[PDB]
Amino acid sequence: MSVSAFNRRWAAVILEALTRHGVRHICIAPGSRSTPLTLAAAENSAFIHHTHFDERGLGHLALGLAKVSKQPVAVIVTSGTAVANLYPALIEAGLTGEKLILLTADRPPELIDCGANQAIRQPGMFASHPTHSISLPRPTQDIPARWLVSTIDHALGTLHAGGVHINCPFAEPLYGEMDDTGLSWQQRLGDWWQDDKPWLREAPRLESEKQRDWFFWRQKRGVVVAGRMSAEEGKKVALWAQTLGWPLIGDVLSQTGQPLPCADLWLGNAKATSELQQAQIVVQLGSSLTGKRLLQWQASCEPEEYWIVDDIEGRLDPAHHRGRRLIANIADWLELHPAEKRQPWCVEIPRLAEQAMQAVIARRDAFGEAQLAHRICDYLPEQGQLFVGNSLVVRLIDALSQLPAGYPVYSNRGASGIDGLLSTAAGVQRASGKPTLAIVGDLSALYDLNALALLRQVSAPLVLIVVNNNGGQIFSLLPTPQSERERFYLMPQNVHFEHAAAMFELKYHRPQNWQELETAFADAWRTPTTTVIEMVVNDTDGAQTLQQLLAQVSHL
Template sequence: MTKHQIEMTQYLAAFIEEIVQAGVKEAVISPGSRSTPLAMLMAEHPTLKIYIDIDERSAGFFALGLAKASLRPVVLLCTSGTAAANYMPAVVEANLSNIPLVVLTSDRPHELRGVGAPQAIDQIHLYGHHVKEFVEMALPEASAELLNYAKWQGARAVDIALKAPRGPVHLNFPLRQPLMPLLEPSPFSGEQKRHHVHIYSTNETVSSELLAEMLTLCHGKKGLIVMGDLQVAPALAAQIVQLSHQLGFPVLADPLSQLRSFGQNEYQVIDQYDSLFRFASVKEQVRAEVIIRMGAMPVSKFLSQYLETLVDARHIIIDPGSMWRDPIKAATDMVHCDETVFVEGLLASVDQAQRDSEWYDQWQRLNRLSKTCMNQYLAAIETLDEGKVVAQLQQHLPNEAALYVGNSMPIRDIDTFFIQTNKQVRIVANRGANGIDGNISTALGMSVTQQPMYALMGDVTFYHDMNGLLMARTHQLNLTLIVINNNGGGIFSFLPQSESPRHFEQLFGTPTDISIEKAANLYDATYHAVQDWEDFQDTLDRAEHHKGLNIIEVKTNRYENVVTHRSVWDNIKAVIDHELL
């Protein structure tokens, strides 16, 4: 061993030990040469669990899923060059959806940059503004000062990733050859005693004066609580619906808010707003005066359009840290505070006697009418239909299951057809950038810590991340994946371009004609093509008791799907218009 290898080992081991002490438990590693010392030392660490993923794009989303499910920071490591560039989509999603990742890229040393050396690209600020912090690490040395520096940077990286708003940090490690670290004796044997940085996080609070002011704004008003993507615990979800009842402010609950599926339904949340806000008659009847919004902007375009019309309303947005999640620019009051502190503070002081009961009851009545109409229509559908897939899947999902939802049509169908349930079901999606890349890998990453785990996505989304299926076989992961195969981009059939048939199939329909079954066989998955609704339920029952990767294909027709959806909404409109006469 050379002096360089000994010093490199000590330096990198100090960094790795510190990120573990700061809370990192998993690392996802994409194999490569320049990252050899970091990879080998991570594998050597006695408590760090490593996952190897040879496709960097899939690896990035697998780490994202791990962090999303565990709410802990996850390390992502790759070699130099375009390998690091392939992490970009997952880094973007982590940044926009507030997922803590610690991205480590290995690099050529400075003397090999910009001189035509192989596998060398400019990695300085590679991810631009998509990371919370970038650090170009010093070249390894074993002086006391540099060992403390490595340790300090490790603790700081984890701290920044976890601080609200959470997100990814990027550290770039220039490394010289030889790249083999010293593993005998193990640098983590405990012989070297190091002091560690202890990190303490506290919640943002809100003053009693501000809470009193918020209650004054709300009392006696026609108000709504709008809940977007927010991974709340069941206890907080219960408090939010209790606050809703006390204030007389109905909760418009996006499926990703967890308020449709937190295990209780004593108080009803509004889960039909996506259908209701399609009708001008409803929007005119239910003009709110106060909006309290928490979490990301909800999925529903019709809800956003409704909120935009409320130009005279007070829009109170609760956003921790420095976030300003207000794409419609409607905020009149921005409260940077932990959501739990805000809700508990209001609950402690709210005066139920000042609630507008008629407003609250009107919302409940409209919601029940819409839900009853939708359920009756779905019950009559005999052919395989995408909306009914959601309804049937919801009935089957076991208590405490998690459901990952792909983008495009599946998340919108979940918004429309997944109604409030008394089961605890955690519903998640990559709604930061709303991309279809990496969805399989994200679901598989979640499956490491979240069981039972289900995923629902379309065929194009499935195709986009087929490489991600390898992780299920490599690491013996358990996931039931339902693929709705309408042979193309079904969401475009709902958009204006579908009314111009010239070039539509070529540019937007994009049929792939891929065989889901052959893809499943390639990765040793258990596959089944659903024939009818009874078969769908039987297949879900079998998958629930089968370990490993289960892929269930449901073939639908894009054009029939549009007709069915619009028929559901037409029926709801007729019932609601009659009610409002």
């Protein structure tokens, strides 16, 4: 009888099904059409509920939660442009693997394409970017609950990685007292309601087989390239490469400890590239490599075989080498393909990597962003985690710093968007509960400025450094044309962030030297709150310092 009650029973089946697939966090934005989903979620004690008013930030909050927790994270939004705002986080998850379950409320079919307020065409609106897309039908008791739970169980059970779009039409009325409408329909699932497993268990595993010629290849002159992986995987790859005697080029995202640091500099030296020409195999673990010199060496190298091991699917070599694309958990893969103790074969590169780091150390004193990046390993919070933003900061840390093995690093380096970094950092913090150091640029902080609202609730100290070099100074590193550079690339906004911090009652510091920065750090780590530290630096110093160091090391 009651449409409002049955809507809520239909939604309750959806939300309960998700709990059987490890969904603990759910991120909710406000609306009316989403009422069946939101009330079902609110009443379900299995969830940790997060809220936000900007649906783009909400999606990135979920992305950060999923990024750290490695579990699917659910999102509820109302119909209309609220749904469209989820696209950035969904795209990023498609590239880096976070499992975002998007429950997007919709108008019913009779209110689409007829000029109805806040009604748009939602099925298929994210095109190929979700891993799975479910377009639910208009709720009716004539479709059994077992169909509804089975379709959700199929999508979640077979989800290797990436987002699921579940479009959820509901017709009005949405409000009213709940009666027993739909209760007997739910009860057809029997004691599934008291169970802890899916209704339909469908969870095939996707994994490459053991490489039967690994004992042959591990005796060749190999190179190990370490991209984005877990903190524990970084430590395991470091030990494996060291045992093989193969040089390890470790990305900032790898947590390997970077035994040959400043690769972005020493890969610019022809003697290093000449030595690497002797490599017969390159084994890359992880992907989304950061530095320009590494991407160029990767594109130019011609080993007999190039292997990429990673748990994300599809091609990951943008240079299309002859070789292998091996889908596996990296730690499992190393156990299936163990190292053999062998004599290291590289002689020149260890020399160059040491000289390169010494060159950077020689320039450590200036109060600039390149120096902050180089020294950042000295400021990492104990038992904490680093969230590195995009543009210059990730490149400068990668090029100039040596991060410790196993120290967790998080980032959005699939599509490398500057649109969701503060809200992602908030989710990264909330997921692990660890003290967090987050570093972003000024345009990045402006882009996601209203996510400072989220950072009013952190469970451990979060230090947000905003490097303010007055524009996107990556475009002073790139060879952009000087005449159009300021207006059409750098886009300086000529702001500071003291008022943004004050708006959201967040502590703020603008340190003018290292002593004041260290004082700010010391105070910030003492309370479970977010502290904003604005480092104001001369626009082009960081880019020019990197260029100068590249040149210096290339001439060694």
